[PDB]
Structure formats: structure tokens, C-alpha cells
Short mmCIF file of all heavy atoms in Angstrom, two decimals:
data_model
loop_
_atom_site.label_atom_id
_atom_site.label_comp_id
_atom_site.label_asym_id
_atom_site.label_seq_id
_atom_site.Cartn_x
_atom_site.Cartn_y
_atom_site.Cartn_z
N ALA A 1 -1.34 -9.01 4.79
CA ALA A 1 -2.21 -9.87 5.58
C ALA A 1 -2.07 -9.60 7.07
O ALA A 1 -3.07 -9.45 7.78
CB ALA A 1 -1.91 -11.34 5.27
N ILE A 2 -0.84 -9.51 7.55
CA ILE A 2 -0.61 -9.24 8.96
C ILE A 2 -1.08 -7.85 9.34
O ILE A 2 -1.51 -7.63 10.48
CB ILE A 2 0.87 -9.47 9.29
CG1 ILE A 2 1.74 -8.50 8.51
CG2 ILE A 2 1.28 -10.86 8.90
CD1 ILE A 2 3.13 -8.40 9.06
N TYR A 3 -1.04 -6.89 8.42
CA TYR A 3 -1.46 -5.55 8.79
C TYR A 3 -2.98 -5.45 8.86
O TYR A 3 -3.52 -4.80 9.77
CB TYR A 3 -0.93 -4.59 7.74
CG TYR A 3 0.57 -4.55 7.72
CD1 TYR A 3 1.26 -5.23 6.73
CD2 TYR A 3 1.29 -3.88 8.67
CE1 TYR A 3 2.62 -5.23 6.69
CE2 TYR A 3 2.66 -3.87 8.64
CZ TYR A 3 3.32 -4.55 7.65
OH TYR A 3 4.69 -4.55 7.60
N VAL A 4 -3.67 -6.16 7.98
CA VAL A 4 -5.12 -6.27 8.07
C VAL A 4 -5.52 -6.99 9.34
O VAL A 4 -6.48 -6.61 10.01
CB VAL A 4 -5.68 -6.97 6.82
CG1 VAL A 4 -7.11 -7.37 7.04
CG2 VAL A 4 -5.58 -6.05 5.62
N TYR A 5 -4.78 -8.04 9.70
CA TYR A 5 -5.07 -8.75 10.94
C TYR A 5 -4.85 -7.86 12.16
O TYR A 5 -5.63 -7.91 13.12
CB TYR A 5 -4.24 -10.02 11.00
CG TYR A 5 -4.52 -10.86 12.21
CD1 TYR A 5 -5.68 -11.60 12.30
CD2 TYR A 5 -3.63 -10.91 13.27
CE1 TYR A 5 -5.95 -12.37 13.40
CE2 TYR A 5 -3.88 -11.67 14.37
CZ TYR A 5 -5.04 -12.40 14.44
OH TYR A 5 -5.29 -13.17 15.55
N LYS A 6 -3.80 -7.03 12.14
CA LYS A 6 -3.57 -6.11 13.25
C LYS A 6 -4.71 -5.11 13.38
O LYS A 6 -5.20 -4.86 14.48
CB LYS A 6 -2.25 -5.36 13.05
CG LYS A 6 -0.99 -6.14 13.32
CD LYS A 6 0.22 -5.30 12.96
CE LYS A 6 1.51 -6.06 13.15
NZ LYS A 6 1.72 -6.43 14.57
N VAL A 7 -5.18 -4.57 12.25
CA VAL A 7 -6.27 -3.59 12.34
C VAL A 7 -7.58 -4.27 12.72
O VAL A 7 -8.42 -3.68 13.41
CB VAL A 7 -6.38 -2.81 11.02
CG1 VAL A 7 -7.56 -1.88 11.05
CG2 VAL A 7 -5.13 -2.02 10.77
N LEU A 8 -7.74 -5.54 12.37
CA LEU A 8 -8.94 -6.28 12.76
C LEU A 8 -8.96 -6.53 14.26
O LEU A 8 -9.99 -6.32 14.91
CB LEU A 8 -9.01 -7.61 12.01
CG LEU A 8 -10.20 -8.51 12.34
CD1 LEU A 8 -11.48 -7.80 12.02
CD2 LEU A 8 -10.13 -9.81 11.57
N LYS A 9 -7.84 -6.96 14.82
CA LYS A 9 -7.77 -7.08 16.27
C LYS A 9 -7.96 -5.74 16.97
O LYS A 9 -8.57 -5.67 18.04
CB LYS A 9 -6.46 -7.72 16.69
CG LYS A 9 -6.28 -9.12 16.16
CD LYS A 9 -7.21 -10.06 16.90
CE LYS A 9 -7.83 -11.06 15.95
NZ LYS A 9 -8.66 -12.05 16.69
N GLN A 10 -7.46 -4.65 16.38
CA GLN A 10 -7.73 -3.35 17.00
C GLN A 10 -9.15 -2.84 16.83
O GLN A 10 -9.51 -1.88 17.52
CB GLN A 10 -6.74 -2.31 16.47
CG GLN A 10 -5.35 -2.53 16.98
CD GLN A 10 -4.37 -1.51 16.46
OE1 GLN A 10 -4.71 -0.65 15.64
NE2 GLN A 10 -3.15 -1.56 16.97
N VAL A 11 -9.98 -3.42 15.97
CA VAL A 11 -11.37 -3.00 15.89
C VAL A 11 -12.37 -4.06 16.35
O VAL A 11 -13.49 -3.71 16.76
CB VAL A 11 -11.71 -2.53 14.46
CG1 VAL A 11 -11.84 -3.72 13.56
CG2 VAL A 11 -12.93 -1.67 14.45
N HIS A 12 -12.00 -5.34 16.33
CA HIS A 12 -12.84 -6.41 16.88
C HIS A 12 -11.90 -7.45 17.47
O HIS A 12 -11.34 -8.28 16.75
CB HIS A 12 -13.75 -7.06 15.83
CG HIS A 12 -14.83 -6.18 15.31
ND1 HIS A 12 -15.96 -5.83 16.02
CD2 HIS A 12 -14.99 -5.62 14.08
CE1 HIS A 12 -16.73 -5.07 15.28
NE2 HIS A 12 -16.17 -4.93 14.10
N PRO A 13 -11.71 -7.44 18.79
CA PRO A 13 -10.71 -8.33 19.41
C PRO A 13 -11.06 -9.80 19.39
O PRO A 13 -10.17 -10.63 19.58
CB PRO A 13 -10.65 -7.81 20.85
CG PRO A 13 -11.96 -7.16 21.06
CD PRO A 13 -12.31 -6.52 19.76
N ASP A 14 -12.31 -10.17 19.19
CA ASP A 14 -12.70 -11.57 19.24
C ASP A 14 -13.03 -12.20 17.89
O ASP A 14 -13.21 -13.42 17.84
CB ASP A 14 -13.91 -11.71 20.15
CG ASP A 14 -13.56 -11.37 21.57
OD1 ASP A 14 -12.37 -11.19 21.84
OD2 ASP A 14 -14.51 -11.27 22.37
N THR A 15 -13.10 -11.43 16.81
CA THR A 15 -13.48 -11.96 15.50
C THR A 15 -12.25 -12.24 14.67
O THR A 15 -11.39 -11.37 14.51
CB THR A 15 -14.41 -11.01 14.75
OG1 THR A 15 -13.75 -9.77 14.53
CG2 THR A 15 -15.70 -10.76 15.53
N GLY A 16 -12.15 -13.46 14.15
CA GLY A 16 -11.08 -13.85 13.26
C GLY A 16 -11.50 -13.64 11.82
O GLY A 16 -12.49 -12.97 11.52
N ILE A 17 -10.73 -14.21 10.90
CA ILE A 17 -10.99 -13.99 9.49
C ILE A 17 -10.44 -15.16 8.71
O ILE A 17 -9.37 -15.69 9.01
CB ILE A 17 -10.39 -12.64 9.04
CG1 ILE A 17 -10.79 -12.31 7.62
CG2 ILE A 17 -8.88 -12.64 9.18
CD1 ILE A 17 -10.49 -10.89 7.24
N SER A 18 -11.18 -15.57 7.68
CA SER A 18 -10.76 -16.66 6.83
C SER A 18 -9.73 -16.17 5.81
O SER A 18 -9.48 -14.98 5.67
CB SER A 18 -11.95 -17.31 6.14
OG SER A 18 -12.54 -16.42 5.21
N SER A 19 -9.15 -17.12 5.09
CA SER A 19 -8.12 -16.79 4.12
C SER A 19 -8.70 -16.22 2.83
O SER A 19 -8.03 -15.42 2.17
CB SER A 19 -7.30 -18.02 3.80
OG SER A 19 -8.10 -18.98 3.13
N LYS A 20 -9.91 -16.61 2.45
CA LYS A 20 -10.52 -16.01 1.28
C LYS A 20 -10.89 -14.55 1.53
O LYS A 20 -10.65 -13.69 0.67
CB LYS A 20 -11.74 -16.81 0.86
CG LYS A 20 -11.39 -18.19 0.33
CD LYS A 20 -12.62 -18.94 -0.11
CE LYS A 20 -12.26 -20.34 -0.58
NZ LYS A 20 -13.48 -21.09 -1.00
N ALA A 21 -11.43 -14.25 2.70
CA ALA A 21 -11.68 -12.85 3.03
C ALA A 21 -10.38 -12.08 3.19
O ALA A 21 -10.34 -10.88 2.89
CB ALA A 21 -12.50 -12.76 4.31
N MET A 22 -9.31 -12.74 3.60
CA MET A 22 -8.01 -12.07 3.62
C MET A 22 -7.54 -11.75 2.21
O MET A 22 -6.96 -10.69 1.98
CB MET A 22 -7.00 -12.92 4.37
CG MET A 22 -5.67 -12.23 4.53
SD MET A 22 -5.84 -10.74 5.50
CE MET A 22 -5.91 -11.44 7.13
N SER A 23 -7.76 -12.66 1.27
CA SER A 23 -7.43 -12.36 -0.12
C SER A 23 -8.25 -11.20 -0.65
O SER A 23 -7.74 -10.33 -1.37
CB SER A 23 -7.66 -13.59 -1.00
OG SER A 23 -6.79 -14.64 -0.64
N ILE A 24 -9.53 -11.13 -0.27
CA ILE A 24 -10.37 -10.03 -0.73
C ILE A 24 -9.92 -8.71 -0.13
O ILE A 24 -9.91 -7.68 -0.81
CB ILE A 24 -11.85 -10.33 -0.41
CG1 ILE A 24 -12.32 -11.51 -1.24
CG2 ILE A 24 -12.70 -9.12 -0.69
CD1 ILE A 24 -13.64 -12.06 -0.82
N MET A 25 -9.48 -8.72 1.12
CA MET A 25 -8.98 -7.49 1.72
C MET A 25 -7.65 -7.07 1.12
O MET A 25 -7.40 -5.88 0.92
CB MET A 25 -8.86 -7.65 3.23
CG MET A 25 -10.19 -7.73 3.91
SD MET A 25 -11.19 -6.28 3.57
CE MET A 25 -10.25 -5.05 4.44
N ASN A 26 -6.79 -8.04 0.81
CA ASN A 26 -5.53 -7.72 0.14
C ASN A 26 -5.77 -7.08 -1.21
O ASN A 26 -5.11 -6.10 -1.58
CB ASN A 26 -4.70 -8.99 -0.01
CG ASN A 26 -3.28 -8.70 -0.41
OD1 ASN A 26 -2.46 -8.34 0.42
ND2 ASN A 26 -2.99 -8.86 -1.69
N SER A 27 -6.74 -7.60 -1.96
CA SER A 27 -7.02 -7.03 -3.28
C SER A 27 -7.69 -5.67 -3.16
O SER A 27 -7.43 -4.78 -3.97
CB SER A 27 -7.89 -7.97 -4.09
OG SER A 27 -7.46 -9.31 -3.97
N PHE A 28 -8.50 -5.47 -2.12
CA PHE A 28 -9.04 -4.14 -1.85
C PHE A 28 -7.94 -3.12 -1.57
O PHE A 28 -7.98 -1.99 -2.08
CB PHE A 28 -10.00 -4.22 -0.67
CG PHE A 28 -10.56 -2.91 -0.25
CD1 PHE A 28 -11.54 -2.28 -0.97
CD2 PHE A 28 -10.11 -2.31 0.91
CE1 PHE A 28 -12.05 -1.07 -0.55
CE2 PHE A 28 -10.62 -1.11 1.33
CZ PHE A 28 -11.59 -0.49 0.60
N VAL A 29 -6.94 -3.51 -0.79
CA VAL A 29 -5.87 -2.57 -0.45
C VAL A 29 -5.04 -2.24 -1.68
O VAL A 29 -4.76 -1.06 -1.95
CB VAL A 29 -5.01 -3.14 0.68
CG1 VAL A 29 -3.79 -2.29 0.86
CG2 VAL A 29 -5.80 -3.20 1.96
N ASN A 30 -4.63 -3.25 -2.45
CA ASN A 30 -3.94 -3.00 -3.71
C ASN A 30 -4.74 -2.11 -4.65
O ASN A 30 -4.18 -1.19 -5.26
CB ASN A 30 -3.60 -4.32 -4.40
CG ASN A 30 -2.51 -5.07 -3.70
OD1 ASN A 30 -1.52 -4.49 -3.27
ND2 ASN A 30 -2.66 -6.38 -3.60
N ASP A 31 -6.04 -2.36 -4.77
CA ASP A 31 -6.87 -1.57 -5.67
C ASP A 31 -6.92 -0.11 -5.26
O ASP A 31 -6.69 0.78 -6.09
CB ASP A 31 -8.28 -2.16 -5.70
CG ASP A 31 -9.17 -1.47 -6.70
OD1 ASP A 31 -8.65 -0.74 -7.56
OD2 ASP A 31 -10.40 -1.68 -6.63
N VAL A 32 -7.27 0.16 -4.01
CA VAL A 32 -7.36 1.55 -3.56
C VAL A 32 -6.01 2.25 -3.63
O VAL A 32 -5.92 3.43 -4.01
CB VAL A 32 -7.95 1.61 -2.14
CG1 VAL A 32 -7.90 3.01 -1.61
CG2 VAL A 32 -9.37 1.11 -2.16
N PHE A 33 -4.93 1.55 -3.28
CA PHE A 33 -3.59 2.07 -3.49
C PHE A 33 -3.35 2.52 -4.93
O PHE A 33 -2.92 3.65 -5.18
CB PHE A 33 -2.56 1.01 -3.11
CG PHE A 33 -1.15 1.47 -3.28
CD1 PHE A 33 -0.57 2.32 -2.36
CD2 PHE A 33 -0.41 1.09 -4.38
CE1 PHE A 33 0.72 2.75 -2.52
CE2 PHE A 33 0.87 1.52 -4.54
CZ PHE A 33 1.44 2.35 -3.62
N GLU A 34 -3.57 1.62 -5.89
CA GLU A 34 -3.37 1.97 -7.29
C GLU A 34 -4.25 3.12 -7.75
O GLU A 34 -3.79 3.99 -8.48
CB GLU A 34 -3.61 0.74 -8.15
CG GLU A 34 -2.53 -0.32 -8.02
CD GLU A 34 -2.79 -1.55 -8.85
OE1 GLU A 34 -3.89 -1.69 -9.41
OE2 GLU A 34 -1.88 -2.41 -8.94
N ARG A 35 -5.48 3.17 -7.26
CA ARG A 35 -6.38 4.27 -7.62
C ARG A 35 -5.84 5.61 -7.14
O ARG A 35 -5.77 6.58 -7.91
CB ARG A 35 -7.76 3.97 -7.03
CG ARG A 35 -8.44 2.85 -7.77
CD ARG A 35 -9.79 2.51 -7.20
NE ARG A 35 -10.87 3.38 -7.62
CZ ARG A 35 -12.13 3.20 -7.26
NH1 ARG A 35 -12.44 2.17 -6.48
NH2 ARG A 35 -13.07 4.02 -7.69
N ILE A 36 -5.42 5.67 -5.88
CA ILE A 36 -4.99 6.94 -5.32
C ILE A 36 -3.65 7.37 -5.90
O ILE A 36 -3.46 8.54 -6.25
CB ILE A 36 -4.93 6.87 -3.79
CG1 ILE A 36 -6.31 6.61 -3.22
CG2 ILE A 36 -4.37 8.13 -3.24
CD1 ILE A 36 -6.28 6.31 -1.75
N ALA A 37 -2.70 6.44 -6.03
CA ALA A 37 -1.42 6.78 -6.63
C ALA A 37 -1.55 7.16 -8.10
O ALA A 37 -0.84 8.05 -8.56
CB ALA A 37 -0.44 5.63 -6.47
N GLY A 38 -2.49 6.56 -8.82
CA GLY A 38 -2.78 6.97 -10.17
C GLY A 38 -3.28 8.39 -10.27
O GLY A 38 -2.73 9.20 -11.03
N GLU A 39 -4.35 8.70 -9.54
CA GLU A 39 -4.86 10.06 -9.56
C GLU A 39 -3.81 11.07 -9.11
O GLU A 39 -3.75 12.18 -9.65
CB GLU A 39 -6.11 10.17 -8.69
CG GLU A 39 -6.75 11.53 -8.79
CD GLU A 39 -7.29 11.81 -10.18
OE1 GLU A 39 -7.61 10.84 -10.91
OE2 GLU A 39 -7.36 12.99 -10.56
N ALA A 40 -2.97 10.71 -8.14
CA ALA A 40 -1.93 11.64 -7.70
C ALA A 40 -0.88 11.86 -8.78
O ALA A 40 -0.42 12.99 -8.98
CB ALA A 40 -1.28 11.12 -6.42
N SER A 41 -0.47 10.80 -9.47
CA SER A 41 0.45 10.97 -10.59
C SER A 41 -0.15 11.86 -11.68
O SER A 41 0.54 12.71 -12.24
CB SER A 41 0.82 9.61 -11.16
OG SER A 41 1.67 9.75 -12.28
N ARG A 42 -1.43 11.67 -11.99
CA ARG A 42 -2.09 12.53 -12.96
C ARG A 42 -2.10 13.99 -12.51
O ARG A 42 -1.82 14.89 -13.30
CB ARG A 42 -3.51 12.04 -13.22
CG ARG A 42 -3.56 10.73 -13.97
CD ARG A 42 -4.98 10.34 -14.30
NE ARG A 42 -5.04 9.37 -15.39
CZ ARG A 42 -5.12 9.71 -16.67
NH1 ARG A 42 -5.15 10.99 -17.02
NH2 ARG A 42 -5.18 8.77 -17.61
N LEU A 43 -2.43 14.24 -11.24
CA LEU A 43 -2.36 15.59 -10.71
C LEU A 43 -0.98 16.20 -10.85
O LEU A 43 -0.84 17.38 -11.20
CB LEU A 43 -2.77 15.61 -9.24
CG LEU A 43 -4.25 15.54 -8.90
CD1 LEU A 43 -4.42 15.16 -7.46
CD2 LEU A 43 -4.86 16.88 -9.16
N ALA A 44 0.06 15.43 -10.56
CA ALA A 44 1.42 15.96 -10.69
C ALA A 44 1.77 16.26 -12.14
O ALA A 44 2.46 17.24 -12.42
CB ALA A 44 2.42 14.98 -10.09
N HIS A 45 1.32 15.43 -13.08
CA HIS A 45 1.59 15.70 -14.49
C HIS A 45 0.83 16.93 -14.99
O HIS A 45 1.37 17.70 -15.79
CB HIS A 45 1.23 14.49 -15.34
CG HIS A 45 2.24 13.39 -15.27
ND1 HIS A 45 2.00 12.13 -15.77
CD2 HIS A 45 3.48 13.36 -14.74
CE1 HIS A 45 3.06 11.37 -15.56
NE2 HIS A 45 3.97 12.10 -14.94
N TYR A 46 -0.41 17.12 -14.54
CA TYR A 46 -1.18 18.29 -14.94
C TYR A 46 -0.47 19.58 -14.54
O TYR A 46 -0.39 20.53 -15.33
CB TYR A 46 -2.57 18.24 -14.32
CG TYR A 46 -3.45 17.15 -14.87
CD1 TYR A 46 -4.61 16.78 -14.21
CD2 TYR A 46 -3.14 16.50 -16.05
CE1 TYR A 46 -5.43 15.79 -14.70
CE2 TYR A 46 -3.95 15.51 -16.55
CZ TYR A 46 -5.09 15.15 -15.87
OH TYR A 46 -5.90 14.16 -16.36
N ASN A 47 0.02 19.66 -13.31
CA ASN A 47 0.59 20.88 -12.77
C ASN A 47 2.08 21.03 -13.08
O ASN A 47 2.75 21.82 -12.41
CB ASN A 47 0.36 20.93 -11.27
CG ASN A 47 -1.09 21.08 -10.93
OD1 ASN A 47 -1.69 20.18 -10.34
ND2 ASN A 47 -1.67 22.20 -11.30
N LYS A 48 2.60 20.29 -14.05
CA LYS A 48 3.99 20.42 -14.48
C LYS A 48 4.96 20.18 -13.33
O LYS A 48 6.00 20.84 -13.22
CB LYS A 48 4.24 21.80 -15.09
CG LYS A 48 3.41 22.13 -16.32
CD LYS A 48 3.76 21.25 -17.50
CE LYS A 48 3.01 21.68 -18.75
NZ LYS A 48 1.54 21.43 -18.70
#
């Protein structure tokens, strides 16, 4: 949450964010993380 807030202040210094949108951003970060780490693990298994 704090890291999303830091990047939000670095891209829009005057716009805040609600807690539901913070939950949606947290779930977006977890999702993309799992997607990329999954594909990377698969790549590592393919190449022995």
C-alpha cells in the first residue's frame, strides 16, 4: 500500500486514493507478480 502511494505521489502529487482502489491495486500487483514468476519458473524448468 505504501509503495503504491509513493508511486502515486511521484506521478500525481495532488491526487489521493481510496482504500478500495488501494485493495484493487494490491491485488493487481500480487496478480502480475504471480504471473511473471510463474512463467519464469516454467522457463527455468523447460531449459533444465
Side-chain angles (χ1 to χ4, degrees):
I2 63 164
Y3 296 102
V4 167
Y5 183 74
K6 285 175 183 297
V7 176
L8 179 60
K9 298 288 140 176
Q10 290 180 356
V11 75
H12 292 286
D14 295 352
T15 61
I17 187 167
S18 67
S19 67
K20 292 182 182 179
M22 185 62 79
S23 296
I24 293 168
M25 290 303 292
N26 192 80
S27 317
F28 177 76
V29 170
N30 289 318
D31 185 14
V32 174
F33 181 76
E34 289 179 350
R35 288 179 81 177
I36 297 171
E39 186 65 26
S41 178
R42 291 185 160 270
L43 282 163
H45 284 169
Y46 292 165
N47 293 114
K48 300 294 185 291

